[PDB]
Amino acid sequence: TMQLMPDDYTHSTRYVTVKDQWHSRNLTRETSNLNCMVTITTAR
Amino acid sequence: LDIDPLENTDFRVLELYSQKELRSSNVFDLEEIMREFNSYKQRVKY
Numbered sequence: 001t002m003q004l005m006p007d008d009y010t011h012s013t014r015y016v017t018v019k020d021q022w023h024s025r026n027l028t029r030e031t032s033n034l035n036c037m038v039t040i041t042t043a044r
Numbered sequence: 045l046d047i048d049p050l051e052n053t054d055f056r057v058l059e060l061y062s063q064k065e066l067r068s069s070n071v072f073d074l075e076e077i078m079r080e081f082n083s084y085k086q087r088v089k090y
Contacts, residue, residue, distance in 0.1 A: 010083050011076060021090045041080075044071045 004038060013040040 007014035017036040024031065067073065 010079055012080065012083065019089065021088065044073075 002036065004036070011042050014038070 002017040004015040004017055005019070007016055007019075015038040018033070021033055022031065061069075067075075
């Protein structure tokens with residue numbers, strides 16, 4: 001499980017579970033960065 | 045003949061809907077969409 005924490009800001013309010021991007025170094029490798037993000041927008 | 049003269053009246057500038065109330069009336073507000081766009085356009089940190 002991964003807990004949500006606040007982003008950094010507009011009228012929107014976001015909560016994210018990961019604040020960075022990541023990778024690492026023989027053959028071509030493909031890392032997957034998974035982010036769960038709850039955002040709150042005003043709707044008219 | 046005693047005719048009273050006609051009084052000067054000062055017509056006011058009548059404001060029905062406020063300016064802050066005018067753009068307040070649109071479902072789509074371009075200002076905050078374009079802004080919402082560049083806010084999205086800055087989502088990459090390493």
